[PDB]
Amino acid sequence: IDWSTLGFSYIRTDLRYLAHWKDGEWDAGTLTEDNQIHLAEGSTALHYGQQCFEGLKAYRCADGSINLFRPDQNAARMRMSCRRLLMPELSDEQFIDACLQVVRANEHFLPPYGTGGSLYLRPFVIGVGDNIGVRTAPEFIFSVFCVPVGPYFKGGLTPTNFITSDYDRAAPHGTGAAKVGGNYAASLLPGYEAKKRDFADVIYLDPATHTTIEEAGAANFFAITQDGQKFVTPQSPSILPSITKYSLLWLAEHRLGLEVEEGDIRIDELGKFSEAGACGTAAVITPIGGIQHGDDFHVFYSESEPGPVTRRLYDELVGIQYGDKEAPEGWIVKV
Amino acid sequence: IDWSTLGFSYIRTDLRYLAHWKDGEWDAGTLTEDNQIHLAEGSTALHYGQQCFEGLKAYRCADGSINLFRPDQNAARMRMSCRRLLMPELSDEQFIDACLQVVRANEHFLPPYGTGGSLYLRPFVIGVGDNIGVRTAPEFIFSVFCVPVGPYFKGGLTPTNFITSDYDRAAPHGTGAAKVGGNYAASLLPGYEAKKRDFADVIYLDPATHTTIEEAGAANFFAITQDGQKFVTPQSPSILPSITKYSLLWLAEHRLGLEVEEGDIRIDELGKFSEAGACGTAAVITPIGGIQHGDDFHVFYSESEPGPVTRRLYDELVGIQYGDKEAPEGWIVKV
Ligand SMILES: N[C@@H](CCC(=O)O)C(=O)O
Ligand SMILES: N[C@@H](CCC(=O)O)C(=O)O
């Protein structure tokens, strides 16, 4: 309950949502206190990476109300991840309702206003049931559990450095556009090496030729030109469609009145941007001080201070989530 | 118990091996009857594909003895898979001892000589314990269960067809050289699309350019030149180092008097080979009738009969496994 020192680690909450799929259909689902998953030793989730997940947060507002941020988008994306791995899909209704149930049943774990914390929801689908050869599972499990997470920046927006790697987290036409475990497994080694070099994480280029930027490992990448007029973010069929990224893209155009561009960002022309950063649910905009690519270390704005436009986007997107700023129609759902 | 109708599907055997890793080391491991894995809802094996596995067989010889085929090779390979995903390694000692324990305790499930069946072993390692962020698991489980099996892709040197795909199962610098779940997860959709078109599976091409053959996603690929004097197989950092492939590589040279080469095999020069096949533990050389690439279906030898060199490699490989032919030194561990 010490909201203050709360970080991003697992803490067992009271109830989690658990649903089962078998013989063509999902059951109604239920809340359980267990927290332990039980599955066949041959489950495809354990042998053939047939698994996918999502990540969203619930925030308590100053007025005491509770906000769930764009749950519909997570529903949509996990449906696409399920399709990619041949797993049954969940409707917005069942997905949203499961999140609502977990939040409500675990309301006492939602960090109060004042503490920059939040209640992190982890919905996921895994292939289960007896099996041995590579194929889609005969049964599946959909579960949603939550964990309270304290502020990500215990000191305020602070930039960190990323480094490029020869390793690929995804193939040109692989599963990089879906939020599946395999992409993350592949990121373990390079991520470890980056951190062993004192870097927060690595910035993956692009599978085919390692010339343009893809992602940072746990977040999408965005950069702002030198003239602070345009917001640019990579467009690739191998990067995860970050909900935070598309949110900022909208905010940048209708809130900050900036130019928006979904295109390529070559690692050779970083000087074209005055600042850059990583965006994701957990990090919620991580200012990027500098990027190490080979021999040189390229700093965009500051290695200790966040860029001006980055602050705007951040404070903006954050205000909406916590209900301090006016939320765009459709976004945010009251619990 | 009907050995003759055995295919490649899960059948619950009596006992499986289970070992736990925690606080820096593996326990001795034990035998259990369970067959259901119990793990934390946030286990990395479920969310971040931190999992790897092996596949090898035990065989009943005519003289009554039992052969375990090159288990040392599987142990070494699983060490490489583990290393790639930052999972703790298992020594040959514990790995081989685990399979021996499983074979001995489930000997009554070993298909008798005369039935081309075998006892398939499935060793695997998964990251477990409470967790939420992308990182290596705090604990791990190592387990080995067995399943009596027959043919994977038909039986008795009957050729099957394969088809090219735009999809990639692995990246140029990803986890393609390791036996990890993410690779198979990626192959699910394309593998399904192939089976719908009546093909056995997809034969993948290099991720970066799609110009050379990689492997089938469940087997390596090999071909015999038109003059029938040379055995050719692809050399790539993104394909699995198949034990069956290396075995065939050895047999081809030192037993069949063939020339051997590991190199590029362009998909546009299939006419350079009189025969082609897919090899693996489950596959045990599956003759390739033809390969569909775009609108072109290419038959190397026959869509109904195996080539003569393929037949020789198969008889030598299978003869060794079942104890009918002298085994090369080091290959074969009597259970
Ligand atoms: N899937 C990421 C979270 C992404 C986010 O914070 O939006 C993780 O488990 O670390
Ligand atoms: N490990 C593969 C089997 C490989 C083989 O058939 O040799 C699978 O589970 O599909």
XYZ file of C-alpha atoms and ligand atoms in Angstrom:
690
model
C 0.000 0.000 0.000
C 3.103 2.218 0.021
C 2.097 3.905 -3.244
C 5.165 6.152 -3.003
C 7.907 3.559 -3.546
C 5.748 1.379 -5.802
C 7.573 0.470 -9.012
C 6.747 -1.852 -11.917
C 6.844 -5.280 -10.264
C 4.347 -8.066 -9.719
C 2.145 -7.840 -6.643
C -0.621 -10.370 -6.079
C -3.994 -8.635 -6.138
C -7.234 -10.232 -4.954
C -9.164 -11.354 -8.033
C -8.333 -12.007 -11.666
C -10.656 -12.742 -14.594
C -10.429 -16.240 -16.116
C -12.202 -17.474 -19.260
C -11.921 -20.750 -21.195
C -12.335 -21.562 -24.879
C -13.211 -25.052 -26.075
C -15.240 -26.618 -28.868
C -15.531 -23.357 -30.792
C -16.573 -20.976 -28.018
C -15.587 -18.908 -24.983
C -17.391 -19.464 -21.692
C -18.862 -16.590 -19.668
C -15.688 -16.261 -17.611
C -15.343 -15.727 -13.870
C -13.231 -14.095 -11.165
C -10.825 -16.261 -9.178
C -8.354 -15.670 -6.376
C -5.918 -18.390 -7.543
C -3.239 -16.455 -9.536
C -1.685 -19.725 -10.706
C -2.288 -20.999 -14.242
C -2.727 -24.748 -14.696
C -2.226 -26.211 -18.163
C -1.289 -29.345 -20.083
C 2.444 -30.093 -20.201
C 2.160 -30.078 -23.979
C 0.267 -26.773 -24.167
C 1.124 -24.814 -27.304
C 1.600 -21.719 -25.130
C 4.630 -23.400 -23.518
C 6.124 -25.102 -26.591
C 5.159 -23.093 -29.683
C 4.819 -19.569 -28.314
C 1.072 -19.487 -28.984
C 0.368 -16.585 -26.650
C -0.427 -12.880 -26.817
C -1.151 -10.141 -24.330
C -2.141 -6.549 -23.823
C -1.367 -3.826 -21.321
C -3.571 -0.940 -20.224
C -4.085 1.147 -17.092
C -6.855 2.451 -14.869
C -6.298 5.816 -13.153
C -8.111 7.450 -10.249
C -9.103 11.029 -11.007
C -9.022 14.013 -8.664
C -12.831 14.015 -8.452
C -12.621 10.444 -7.229
C -13.758 8.877 -10.511
C -11.811 6.105 -12.264
C -10.533 6.229 -15.830
C -9.739 3.325 -18.146
C -7.719 4.515 -21.146
C -8.946 3.567 -24.632
C -9.851 -0.037 -23.689
C -11.439 -0.449 -27.132
C -8.101 -0.082 -28.913
C -6.529 -2.816 -26.785
C -9.519 -5.017 -27.587
C -8.998 -4.372 -31.283
C -5.254 -4.977 -31.185
C -5.380 -8.209 -29.190
C -7.940 -9.447 -31.692
C -5.350 -8.889 -34.430
C -2.664 -10.635 -32.331
C -4.997 -13.590 -31.790
C -5.695 -13.776 -35.525
C -1.997 -13.773 -36.337
C -1.393 -16.853 -34.163
C -4.662 -18.597 -35.047
C -6.183 -18.013 -31.604
C -9.883 -17.243 -31.046
C -10.753 -13.551 -30.721
C -12.524 -11.669 -27.942
C -15.192 -9.042 -28.607
C -14.809 -5.486 -27.330
C -17.604 -6.295 -24.898
C -16.044 -9.338 -23.250
C -12.591 -7.736 -23.314
C -13.803 -4.441 -21.866
C -16.076 -6.094 -19.332
C -13.280 -8.352 -18.108
C -11.100 -5.309 -17.519
C -13.959 -3.518 -15.757
C -14.600 -6.507 -13.508
C -10.979 -6.794 -12.456
C -10.660 -3.062 -11.761
C -13.856 -2.911 -9.706
C -13.035 -6.084 -7.766
C -9.538 -4.715 -7.079
C -10.422 -1.049 -6.626
C -8.540 -0.947 -3.324
C -5.310 -1.441 -5.297
C -5.806 1.622 -7.479
C -3.230 4.244 -6.433
C -5.003 7.354 -5.081
C -4.719 10.719 -6.806
C -1.520 12.428 -5.705
C 0.535 9.299 -6.225
C 1.537 9.157 -9.871
C 0.699 5.461 -9.737
C -1.914 3.420 -11.602
C -3.523 -0.010 -11.821
C -1.874 -1.981 -14.610
C -4.114 -4.524 -16.301
C -2.589 -7.552 -18.032
C -5.092 -9.363 -20.277
C -3.704 -12.379 -22.125
C -4.599 -15.368 -24.295
C -2.724 -18.688 -24.292
C -3.088 -21.972 -26.148
C -3.726 -24.852 -23.756
C -4.881 -28.468 -23.810
C -3.057 -31.717 -24.588
C -0.807 -31.620 -27.649
C 2.632 -32.408 -29.104
C 3.016 -31.345 -32.730
C 3.180 -27.766 -34.051
C -0.407 -26.630 -34.586
C -2.995 -24.352 -33.027
C -4.159 -25.496 -29.578
C -7.521 -27.255 -29.117
C -8.311 -25.022 -26.142
C -7.481 -21.541 -24.918
C -7.467 -19.430 -21.786
C -8.232 -15.709 -21.587
C -7.248 -14.089 -18.327
C -6.945 -10.612 -16.923
C -5.116 -9.794 -13.729
C -3.996 -6.440 -12.394
C -1.036 -5.002 -10.533
C -0.618 -1.555 -8.996
C 2.327 0.355 -10.477
C 3.842 3.461 -8.913
C 5.094 6.478 -10.906
C 7.465 5.574 -13.736
C 9.566 8.722 -13.298
C 10.150 9.132 -9.564
C 11.677 12.552 -10.087
C 9.858 13.663 -13.208
C 10.510 13.200 -16.922
C 14.107 12.059 -17.269
C 15.857 11.080 -20.498
C 17.684 7.790 -20.975
C 19.994 6.494 -23.700
C 19.352 3.730 -26.218
C 21.716 1.778 -28.441
C 21.355 0.031 -31.801
C 21.888 -3.713 -32.170
C 22.634 -6.170 -34.934
C 19.943 -8.438 -33.445
C 16.347 -8.411 -34.666
C 13.320 -8.544 -32.387
C 11.186 -9.317 -35.444
C 11.367 -10.519 -39.048
C 10.391 -8.363 -42.060
C 7.185 -10.375 -42.404
C 7.073 -11.995 -38.994
C 4.994 -11.334 -35.889
C 6.388 -7.917 -34.980
C 3.047 -6.221 -35.643
C 1.347 -8.445 -33.074
C 1.900 -8.270 -29.327
C 3.149 -11.840 -28.861
C 5.715 -13.409 -26.522
C 8.083 -14.499 -29.281
C 8.993 -10.894 -30.134
C 9.893 -10.232 -26.517
C 11.858 -13.475 -26.092
C 14.046 -12.407 -28.997
C 14.576 -9.021 -27.322
C 15.914 -10.567 -24.095
C 19.553 -10.997 -25.119
C 20.058 -7.656 -26.901
C 18.149 -5.852 -24.158
C 20.409 -7.504 -21.601
C 23.534 -6.421 -23.478
C 22.301 -2.832 -23.800
C 21.702 -2.637 -20.058
C 25.098 -4.233 -19.485
C 26.473 -1.209 -21.363
C 24.429 1.088 -19.112
C 21.765 1.757 -21.754
C 18.058 1.616 -20.896
C 17.390 -0.640 -23.870
C 18.204 -1.028 -27.537
C 16.644 0.641 -30.545
C 15.906 -1.908 -33.249
C 16.433 -0.697 -36.819
C 14.609 -2.687 -39.492
C 15.039 -6.437 -40.227
C 15.647 -6.096 -43.966
C 18.578 -3.654 -43.946
C 19.066 -1.991 -40.546
C 18.890 1.514 -41.990
C 15.656 2.954 -40.578
C 14.335 2.986 -37.008
C 11.695 0.477 -35.845
C 11.091 0.413 -32.081
C 12.881 0.596 -28.728
C 11.871 -2.807 -27.376
C 8.934 -1.945 -25.140
C 7.765 1.220 -26.881
C 7.316 2.965 -30.227
C 9.682 5.699 -31.366
C 8.872 9.300 -32.195
C 11.047 12.287 -33.038
C 10.488 16.010 -33.509
C 12.268 17.908 -36.283
C 14.813 20.629 -35.498
C 12.281 23.373 -36.224
C 9.860 21.796 -33.755
C 7.154 21.868 -36.410
C 6.694 18.179 -37.227
C 6.121 14.992 -35.219
C 7.598 11.984 -37.009
C 7.110 8.308 -36.172
C 8.278 5.229 -38.120
C 5.811 3.416 -40.354
C 6.575 -0.290 -40.681
C 4.613 -3.545 -40.950
C 6.922 -5.045 -38.338
C 6.532 -2.695 -35.380
C 3.817 -2.902 -32.742
C 0.912 -0.486 -33.321
C 1.465 1.356 -30.024
C -1.786 2.819 -28.689
C 0.279 5.519 -26.986
C 1.912 6.327 -30.339
C -1.383 6.755 -32.214
C -2.730 8.797 -29.301
C 0.209 11.209 -29.433
C -0.043 11.348 -33.215
C -3.606 12.632 -32.746
C -2.748 14.929 -29.838
C 0.174 16.427 -31.747
C -2.118 17.390 -34.629
C -5.280 18.500 -32.829
C -3.846 19.725 -29.522
C -0.370 21.061 -30.274
C -1.209 22.107 -33.820
C 1.891 20.361 -35.130
C 2.746 18.657 -38.402
C 2.379 14.869 -38.222
C 4.212 12.272 -40.325
C 4.209 8.463 -40.347
C 7.327 7.564 -42.308
C 10.912 6.350 -42.270
C 13.616 7.649 -39.952
C 17.113 6.695 -41.088
C 19.681 6.252 -38.324
C 22.107 8.317 -40.400
C 20.023 11.484 -40.273
C 19.247 11.865 -36.567
C 20.468 15.448 -36.785
C 17.181 16.233 -38.510
C 15.430 16.118 -35.143
C 15.705 18.372 -32.099
C 14.467 15.609 -29.787
C 13.137 12.049 -29.636
C 11.542 9.621 -27.207
C 9.920 6.248 -26.577
C 6.180 5.952 -25.958
C 4.326 3.123 -24.268
C 1.755 2.304 -21.595
C 4.262 1.610 -18.819
C 6.732 4.358 -19.674
C 4.223 6.883 -21.016
C 6.796 8.821 -23.023
C 10.416 8.127 -22.084
C 12.626 11.034 -23.195
C 15.575 9.797 -25.249
C 18.741 11.669 -24.352
C 20.951 10.065 -26.953
C 21.216 7.066 -29.275
C 24.442 5.114 -29.607
C 24.825 3.780 -33.146
C 28.216 2.202 -33.613
C 31.006 4.584 -32.639
C 29.196 7.888 -32.154
C 26.667 8.830 -29.490
C 24.070 11.209 -30.923
C 22.299 13.484 -28.445
C 19.162 15.213 -29.734
C 18.278 17.757 -27.056
C 19.647 16.993 -23.599
C 21.028 13.934 -21.833
C 19.435 15.021 -18.547
C 16.515 17.223 -19.605
C 13.376 16.367 -21.644
C 12.680 18.344 -24.816
C 10.025 21.118 -24.832
C 7.632 19.455 -27.274
C 8.138 16.138 -25.463
C 6.973 17.775 -22.231
C 3.868 19.145 -23.945
C 2.872 15.773 -25.392
C 3.641 13.999 -22.093
C 1.838 16.369 -19.729
C -1.044 16.448 -22.216
C -1.512 12.700 -22.666
C -0.982 12.205 -18.918
C -3.533 14.855 -17.960
C -6.186 13.150 -20.067
C -5.552 9.714 -18.551
C -5.818 11.078 -15.006
C -8.774 13.252 -15.959
C -7.070 16.600 -15.454
C -7.249 17.544 -19.125
C -10.249 17.175 -21.439
C -10.276 13.725 -23.037
C -10.965 13.342 -26.778
C -14.334 11.778 -27.606
C -14.272 7.991 -27.381
C -11.038 7.865 -25.395
C -11.206 7.004 -21.675
C -13.993 4.934 -20.087
C -15.335 5.596 -16.579
C -15.338 2.583 -14.261
C -1.728 -49.538 -27.671
C -2.468 -50.011 -31.378
C 1.043 -49.240 -32.574
C 0.021 -49.521 -36.230
C -2.343 -46.534 -36.105
C 0.001 -44.326 -34.124
C 0.578 -40.900 -35.646
C 2.052 -37.833 -33.965
C -0.448 -36.813 -31.295
C -0.362 -36.465 -27.524
C -1.035 -39.568 -25.483
C -0.603 -39.387 -21.731
C 2.143 -41.689 -20.540
C 2.621 -42.627 -16.876
C 5.506 -40.543 -15.553
C 7.429 -37.414 -16.533
C 10.584 -35.744 -15.210
C 10.402 -32.349 -13.501
C 13.202 -30.152 -12.154
C 13.172 -26.661 -10.684
C 15.698 -23.853 -10.902
C 15.832 -21.204 -8.193
C 18.379 -19.115 -6.324
C 21.094 -19.902 -8.864
C 20.820 -23.668 -9.373
C 18.831 -26.691 -10.551
C 17.514 -29.249 -8.075
C 18.079 -32.967 -8.702
C 14.725 -33.314 -10.437
C 12.044 -35.918 -9.774
C 9.477 -38.086 -11.527
C 5.822 -37.146 -11.278
C 2.561 -38.444 -12.708
C 0.854 -35.039 -13.005
C 1.168 -33.932 -16.703
C -0.236 -30.490 -15.864
C 2.198 -27.612 -15.361
C 1.365 -25.172 -12.567
C 2.833 -21.668 -12.877
C 2.497 -18.015 -11.896
C -0.017 -16.085 -13.990
C 2.763 -13.656 -14.824
C 5.327 -16.317 -15.793
C 7.633 -15.125 -18.590
C 7.017 -18.457 -20.340
C 3.415 -17.299 -20.853
C 3.909 -13.621 -21.676
C 7.385 -13.232 -23.169
C 7.947 -16.537 -24.936
C 10.802 -17.451 -22.600
C 10.671 -21.131 -23.438
C 12.671 -23.630 -25.478
C 12.448 -27.324 -26.177
C 14.022 -30.378 -27.705
C 12.815 -33.475 -29.480
C 14.458 -36.884 -29.625
C 13.443 -40.531 -29.725
C 14.028 -43.870 -28.017
C 13.810 -46.991 -30.205
C 13.176 -50.690 -29.556
C 15.812 -52.812 -31.311
C 15.203 -56.308 -32.696
C 17.500 -57.792 -30.062
C 15.301 -56.318 -27.355
C 17.616 -53.444 -26.378
C 16.625 -49.755 -26.474
C 18.405 -47.043 -28.460
C 18.456 -43.346 -27.575
C 19.736 -41.442 -30.644
C 22.435 -38.783 -30.153
C 20.978 -37.280 -26.928
C 24.260 -35.452 -26.316
C 23.564 -33.378 -29.439
C 20.122 -32.366 -28.128
C 21.582 -31.454 -24.729
C 24.191 -29.226 -26.353
C 21.600 -27.606 -28.586
C 19.234 -26.911 -25.718
C 22.160 -25.236 -23.969
C 22.380 -22.891 -26.947
C 18.615 -22.296 -26.964
C 18.705 -21.547 -23.228
C 21.669 -19.226 -23.610
C 19.853 -17.280 -26.346
C 16.898 -16.554 -24.060
C 18.932 -15.970 -20.884
C 17.685 -19.198 -19.307
C 19.880 -21.436 -17.079
C 21.696 -24.235 -18.910
C 21.359 -27.980 -18.336
C 24.392 -30.270 -18.454
C 24.453 -33.397 -20.645
C 24.529 -35.241 -17.329
C 21.152 -34.053 -16.098
C 19.615 -33.827 -19.568
C 20.475 -37.353 -20.619
C 19.731 -38.732 -17.166
C 16.272 -37.148 -17.359
C 15.459 -38.788 -20.698
C 16.816 -42.157 -19.479
C 14.618 -41.946 -16.372
C 11.578 -41.144 -18.511
C 12.242 -43.910 -21.041
C 12.831 -46.527 -18.346
C 9.739 -45.565 -16.320
C 7.550 -45.589 -19.443
C 9.184 -48.512 -21.244
C 5.797 -50.178 -21.727
C 4.884 -47.300 -24.080
C 7.833 -48.012 -26.391
C 6.501 -49.385 -29.726
C 7.854 -52.922 -30.338
C 10.228 -53.774 -33.181
C 8.279 -54.442 -36.353
C 6.103 -51.408 -35.718
C 7.924 -48.457 -37.213
C 7.038 -46.548 -34.042
C 9.232 -44.849 -31.481
C 9.019 -43.215 -28.081
C 9.232 -39.458 -28.599
C 10.838 -37.401 -25.839
C 9.977 -33.754 -25.234
C 12.444 -31.971 -22.916
C 11.600 -28.313 -22.332
C 12.551 -25.312 -20.215
C 10.210 -22.473 -19.278
C 10.614 -19.307 -17.245
C 8.278 -19.187 -14.246
C 7.554 -17.346 -11.002
C 5.845 -14.006 -10.360
C 6.644 -11.251 -12.861
C 5.153 -8.476 -15.020
C 7.934 -6.636 -16.817
C 9.921 -7.906 -19.791
C 12.914 -9.654 -18.242
C 14.367 -13.081 -17.596
C 12.306 -15.149 -15.127
C 13.353 -15.470 -11.455
C 12.770 -19.217 -11.659
C 12.615 -21.955 -14.276
C 11.249 -25.425 -14.809
C 12.901 -28.199 -16.818
C 10.691 -31.133 -17.722
C 10.740 -34.185 -19.957
C 7.665 -36.183 -20.954
C 7.349 -38.866 -23.609
C 4.735 -39.926 -26.153
C 4.714 -43.070 -28.308
C 4.526 -41.960 -31.956
C 4.531 -43.123 -35.555
C 4.819 -40.920 -38.707
C 4.861 -37.094 -38.685
C 4.277 -36.481 -42.392
C 2.891 -39.756 -43.671
C 4.902 -42.928 -43.583
C 7.104 -45.203 -45.632
C 9.105 -42.770 -47.789
C 5.965 -41.238 -49.285
C 6.768 -37.813 -50.764
C 4.682 -34.749 -49.954
C 4.589 -31.250 -51.405
C 5.630 -27.936 -49.899
C 4.900 -24.326 -50.844
C 6.776 -21.015 -50.629
C 5.423 -18.211 -48.449
C 5.738 -14.435 -48.140
C 5.771 -14.875 -44.356
C 8.896 -15.347 -42.241
C 9.186 -17.670 -39.251
C 12.481 -16.046 -38.281
C 14.487 -12.838 -38.701
C 17.952 -12.527 -40.283
C 19.416 -11.996 -36.807
C 16.681 -13.402 -34.614
C 16.094 -16.676 -32.785
C 15.905 -18.885 -35.866
C 18.978 -20.881 -34.836
C 17.458 -21.736 -31.453
C 14.617 -24.173 -30.788
C 12.267 -21.650 -29.146
C 8.487 -21.224 -29.217
C 8.436 -17.837 -30.916
C 9.719 -19.397 -34.143
C 6.835 -21.856 -34.243
C 4.246 -19.265 -33.238
C 5.248 -17.270 -36.324
C 4.915 -20.362 -38.543
C 1.334 -21.105 -37.464
C -0.531 -18.885 -39.952
C 1.590 -19.678 -43.023
C 1.652 -23.361 -42.097
C -2.130 -23.311 -41.896
C -2.465 -21.568 -45.266
C -0.285 -24.262 -46.825
C -2.254 -27.168 -45.371
C -5.438 -25.599 -46.757
C -3.880 -25.660 -50.232
C -3.163 -29.357 -49.667
C 0.546 -28.857 -48.954
C 2.322 -30.559 -46.057
C 4.004 -27.346 -44.943
C 5.787 -24.189 -46.049
C 9.416 -24.123 -47.089
C 10.812 -20.815 -45.921
C 13.223 -18.577 -47.824
C 15.824 -16.228 -46.360
C 14.034 -13.374 -44.487
C 16.167 -10.545 -45.889
C 15.612 -11.293 -49.580
C 13.503 -14.438 -50.046
C 15.936 -15.792 -52.648
C 17.389 -18.865 -50.976
C 15.838 -21.816 -49.152
C 15.993 -21.856 -45.345
C 13.979 -24.824 -44.023
C 10.404 -26.116 -43.556
C 9.650 -24.895 -40.036
C 9.463 -28.476 -38.778
C 12.433 -29.812 -40.747
C 15.673 -28.791 -42.478
C 15.911 -29.122 -46.272
C 18.394 -31.082 -48.364
C 18.766 -31.853 -52.065
C 20.775 -34.205 -54.255
C 22.411 -32.879 -57.448
C 21.324 -34.147 -60.873
C 24.276 -36.530 -61.189
C 23.284 -37.958 -57.806
C 26.828 -37.454 -56.531
C 26.363 -34.524 -54.163
C 24.295 -33.866 -51.033
C 23.433 -30.187 -50.627
C 21.812 -28.385 -47.692
C 21.466 -24.676 -46.857
C 23.905 -22.811 -44.637
C 22.160 -20.062 -42.724
C 22.377 -18.393 -39.311
C 18.563 -18.278 -39.186
C 17.729 -21.976 -39.528
C 17.743 -24.629 -36.818
C 20.927 -26.686 -36.585
C 19.096 -29.964 -37.250
C 20.663 -33.014 -35.641
C 19.083 -35.180 -38.334
C 20.640 -32.892 -40.972
C 24.134 -33.117 -39.464
C 23.686 -36.865 -39.157
C 22.714 -37.146 -42.840
C 25.643 -34.882 -43.683
C 27.954 -37.401 -41.984
C 26.306 -40.524 -43.429
C 26.292 -39.068 -46.941
C 30.051 -38.550 -46.861
C 31.419 -41.454 -44.804
C 28.868 -44.151 -45.624
C 27.323 -43.383 -49.012
C 30.461 -41.992 -50.630
C 28.722 -38.777 -51.664
C 30.118 -35.267 -51.924
C 28.702 -32.907 -49.305
C 28.117 -29.149 -49.306
C 26.490 -26.636 -46.980
C 25.668 -23.574 -49.039
C 23.076 -21.501 -50.843
C 20.223 -23.140 -52.701
C 18.349 -20.485 -54.689
C 14.631 -21.117 -55.166
C 15.089 -20.396 -58.864
C 17.632 -23.178 -59.447
C 15.664 -26.195 -58.254
C 16.340 -27.874 -61.602
C 19.906 -28.317 -60.401
C 18.757 -31.206 -58.186
C 17.465 -34.676 -59.018
C 15.870 -35.144 -55.558
C 14.897 -33.175 -52.460
C 13.685 -33.986 -48.964
C 12.962 -32.568 -45.525
C 14.692 -34.082 -42.475
C 14.126 -34.031 -38.734
C 13.351 -36.126 -35.659
C 9.626 -36.332 -36.324
C 10.051 -36.104 -40.080
C 12.774 -38.788 -40.455
C 13.447 -37.766 -44.070
C 10.197 -36.898 -45.821
C 10.745 -37.001 -49.604
C 9.714 -33.780 -51.303
C 7.597 -34.490 -54.365
C 7.540 -30.922 -55.559
C 7.758 -27.319 -54.443
C 5.240 -24.634 -55.340
C 6.755 -21.183 -55.742
C 4.282 -18.654 -57.056
C 2.596 -20.230 -60.076
C 5.389 -22.756 -60.620
C 5.238 -26.293 -59.224
C 8.601 -28.007 -59.455
C 8.975 -31.778 -59.204
C 12.506 -33.032 -58.625
C 11.997 -36.760 -59.014
C 8.506 -38.077 -58.365
C 5.332 -37.042 -56.609
C 4.752 -40.671 -55.570
C 8.148 -42.361 -55.218
C 11.289 -41.289 -53.305
C 14.537 -40.727 -55.165
C 17.206 -43.471 -54.943
C 19.704 -41.409 -52.958
C 16.957 -40.319 -50.533
C 16.031 -43.971 -49.989
C 19.649 -44.861 -49.195
C 20.071 -42.022 -46.682
C 16.769 -43.018 -45.078
C 17.640 -46.717 -44.781
C 21.042 -45.869 -43.290
C 19.643 -43.331 -40.811
C 16.684 -45.477 -39.704
C 18.792 -48.648 -39.675
C 21.191 -47.031 -37.212
C 18.427 -45.714 -34.957
C 16.724 -49.117 -34.663
C 19.983 -51.027 -34.222
C 19.971 -52.816 -37.566
C 23.068 -51.030 -38.819
C 26.381 -50.324 -37.146
C 26.129 -46.987 -35.353
C 28.923 -44.393 -35.712
C 30.938 -43.962 -32.494
C 29.199 -41.737 -29.957
C 25.846 -42.029 -31.703
C 23.491 -44.267 -29.712
C 23.116 -44.600 -25.971
C 21.682 -47.925 -24.799
C 18.938 -47.339 -22.239
N 4.143 -5.156 -22.825
C 5.032 -4.225 -22.081
C 4.244 -3.018 -21.586
C 4.052 -1.942 -22.627
C 3.468 -0.676 -22.042
O 3.896 -0.288 -20.933
O 2.591 -0.076 -22.697
C 5.654 -4.926 -20.895
O 5.086 -5.955 -20.480
O 6.683 -4.432 -20.397
N 9.586 -30.218 -32.477
C 8.724 -30.448 -33.668
C 8.967 -31.840 -34.241
C 10.172 -31.931 -35.145
C 10.250 -33.255 -35.864
O 9.192 -33.742 -36.322
O 11.369 -33.802 -35.974
C 7.266 -30.319 -33.294
O 6.973 -30.441 -32.089
O 6.445 -30.109 -34.206
